[PDB]
Amino acid sequence: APQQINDIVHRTITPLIEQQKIPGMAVAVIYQGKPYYFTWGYADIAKKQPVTQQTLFELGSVSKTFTGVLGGDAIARGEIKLSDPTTKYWPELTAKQWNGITLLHLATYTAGGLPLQVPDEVKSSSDLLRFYQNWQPAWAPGTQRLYANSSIGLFGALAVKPSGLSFEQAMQTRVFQPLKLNHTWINVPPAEEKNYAWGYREGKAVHVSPGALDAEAYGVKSTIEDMARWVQSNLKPLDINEKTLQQGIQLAQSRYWQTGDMYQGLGWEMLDWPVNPDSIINGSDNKIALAARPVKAITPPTPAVRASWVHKTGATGGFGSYVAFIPEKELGIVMLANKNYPNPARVDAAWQILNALQ
Numbered sequence: 001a002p003q004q005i006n007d008i009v010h011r012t013i014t015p016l017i018e019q020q021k022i023p024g025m026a027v028a029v030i031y032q033g034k035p036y037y038f039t040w041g042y043a044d045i046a047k048k049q050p051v052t053q054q055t056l057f058e059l060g061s062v063s064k065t066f067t068g069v070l071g072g073d074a075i076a077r078g079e080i081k082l083s084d085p086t087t088k089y090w091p092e093l094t095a096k097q098w099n100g101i102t103l104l105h106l107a108t109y110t111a112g113g114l115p116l117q118v119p120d121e122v123k124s125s126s127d128l129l130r131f132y133q134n135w136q137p138a139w140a141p142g143t144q145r146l147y148a149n150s151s152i153g154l155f156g157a158l159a160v161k162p163s164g165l166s167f168e169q170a171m172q173t174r175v176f177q178p179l180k181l182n183h184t185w186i187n188v189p190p191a192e193e194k195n196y197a198w199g200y201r202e203g204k205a206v207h208v209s210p211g212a213l214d215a216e217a218y219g220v221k222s223t224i225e226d227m228a229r230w231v232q233s234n235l236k237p238l239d240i241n242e243k244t245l246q247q248g249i250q251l252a253q254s255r256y257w258q259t260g261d262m263y264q265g266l267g268w269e270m271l272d273w274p275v276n277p278d279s280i281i282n283g284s285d286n287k288i289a290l291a292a293r294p295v296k297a298i299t300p301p302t303p304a305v306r307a308s309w310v311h312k313t314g315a316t317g318g319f320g321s322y323v324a325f326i327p328e329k330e331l332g333i334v335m336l337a338n339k340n341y342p343n344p345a346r347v348d349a350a351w352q353i354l355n356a357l358q
């Protein structure tokens with residue numbers, strides 16, 4: 001890499017790893033559309049396995065960007081519409097609170113207070129139907145945003161229904177394969193387990209637990225190389241040869257709602273560039289990011305604005321990730337770690353790096 005990228009990356013990440021006691025880390029910078037990789041520390045402490053460009057990390061909620069793009073692709077295919085009622089795709093959802101709740105609402109966390117977490121007790125499709133039927137909204141549809149795995153998780157599950165494919169098969173065939181993300185998995189195969197990093201929580205080695213709607217909301221594992229490729233595809237969707245996927249990426253970066261200075265897309269969240277770093281850094285803290293906030297509808301939604309800071313934080317019990325890019329500048333970053341450390345520390349590191357290279 002050029003010495004400039006090398007120096008800002010190392011001057012930013014070394015202190016971060018030290019301060020946050022991160023066991024292992026991988027970073028990709030996309031600069032003028034080209035990837036540069038960096039690795040530190042351990043994928044497995046006990047077995048002394050280093051982090052490499054082939055190490056798989058749990059993306060956690062960064063998975064929602066894939067779910068948003070898969071959904072966008074389904075729209076482009078004419079299989080679903082964001083304006084469709086939820087009940088169109090799940091007829092057994094007959095409780096009257098679901099009247100007026102559309103796939104847009106589910107995708108953008110504005111259904112009216114669907115919970116952050118699907119309860120642990122909810123396993124089967126039966127359990128799930130019962131859970132959503134009994135769910136009582138706090139607000140009317142399209143009035144407040146409350147970030148929720150049970151919202152976009154349901155979107156993902158319903159969005160692939162017309163295709164006839166499982167969510168995994170839909171994602172593999174329609175997103176991972178076309179984009180050559182050949183080391184990106186919802187379920188890590190035995191052949192790839194050698195590369196699967198351990199997560200670390202209070203010093204214990206942990207992997208993500210199975211849960212309802214896990215694949216759709218937080219279930220993707222990937223390498224720094226594939227994630228750089230994911231950023232490149234979202235930076236430059238017009239280079240993608242599959243028409244519906246190209247279109248779906250653009251729909252995921254459309255601005256559907258505004259709260260404060262952030263805009264909600266499908267998975268992705270966006271701010272106008274130039275951004276105020278205090279807004280993204282402080283905004284990434286869960287005191288704001290998980291808070292219930294009123295939303296203003298963008299009527300109709302704004303197509304993907306090139307002059308945007310487009311990003312997503314993501315965590316599991318043992319992992320902490322961040323992706324951010326600025327289409328206007330052919331510039332982006334992926335930060336993958338096997339500890340869940342505070343979001344603002346991630347966004348601060350990212351902004352220092354990208355601001356320096358912009």
Ligand SMILES: O=C(O)[C@@H]1CCCC[C@@H]1c1n[nH]c(=S)[nH]1
Nearest residue numbers: 060061116313314315316317340
């Ligand atoms: O990925 C995130 O950051 C989410 C936000 C908080 C609750 C649900 C998710 C979560 N992932 N890992 C843990 S712990 N929680």
Ligand SMILES: O=C(O)[C@@H]1CCCC[C@@H]1c1n[nH]c(=S)[nH]1
Nearest residue numbers: 206207208209218315316317318
């Ligand atoms: O347990 C949590 O805090 C989270 C539950 C929702 C997102 C995924 C996280 C997770 N599950 N198992 C491991 S490790 N992390």
